[PDB]
Each structure stands twice: as structure tokens, then as C-alpha cells.
Design a binder for this molecule. Sequence first.
Ligand code: NI
Length: 128
Amino acid sequence: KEEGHEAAAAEAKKETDLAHVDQVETFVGKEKYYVVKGTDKKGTALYVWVPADKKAKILSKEAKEGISEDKAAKIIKDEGLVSKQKEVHLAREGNVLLWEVTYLDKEGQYSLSYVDFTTGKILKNITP
Ligand code: NI
């Protein structure tokens, strides 16, 4: 069992329309979020981002309301930033919902770009 996941899944079902949990992942950025993926009772795919901070607000969106994980990767590739695509995770910072796209950039350096979940706008490109 992964730290915080059982609690996050229960919090997601309690406070939203999520009925079934498929996966939970911890996302740690400026803040920590448990990203809970599943479906409502209608069977609609829903994402719920539950803050570790109990004072912060839970956010949820239907999956169909955001760009896909592949599209997030494609956005960064189409931006000409990628030598080797690596991974993508659903993510959040403050009240901004995000896809975090990781890749080796044009200098071979491991880099991260944050793409807006809804708009597909590249919000930040970081090379640690
Ligand atoms: Ni059901």
C-alpha cells in the first residue's frame, strides 16, 4: 500500500462524483497532491486532485475536458524542444491543473515542461 493513497481515494469518493477508483498516484511539486483517476456512476472518466494540505481545495475534471497525455507530449515535441520523449504525468500546482511532460531536450538535458490540462498552453519549461 502506497502512503496516503487509501485516504486520498476515500476523500475523492466522499467529496466528488467519483464512484470507482482505477489508480492513485502521488504528485510532488511545489505542493503534494494525490491524483485519483476513475469513473463516476455513469462510467464517465474523471480525475480528482486531492491536496495533502487539508486546507487546500480538491479539484476534479472529466478526462474529456482536458487534452490527452499523448497530446501534452505532442505539444512539447511540436514546440521543437525534445530529443527523446520520456514520461508524462497528471499534475497540479496551486489551482492550475497540468500535464508534466519530461524529456531529454536538444542539449541532451533532462527537462520538464508543464502544459495546461485544459488549454494545452505551455506554462513553464524547466531544466533542473
Ligand atoms: Ni459503476
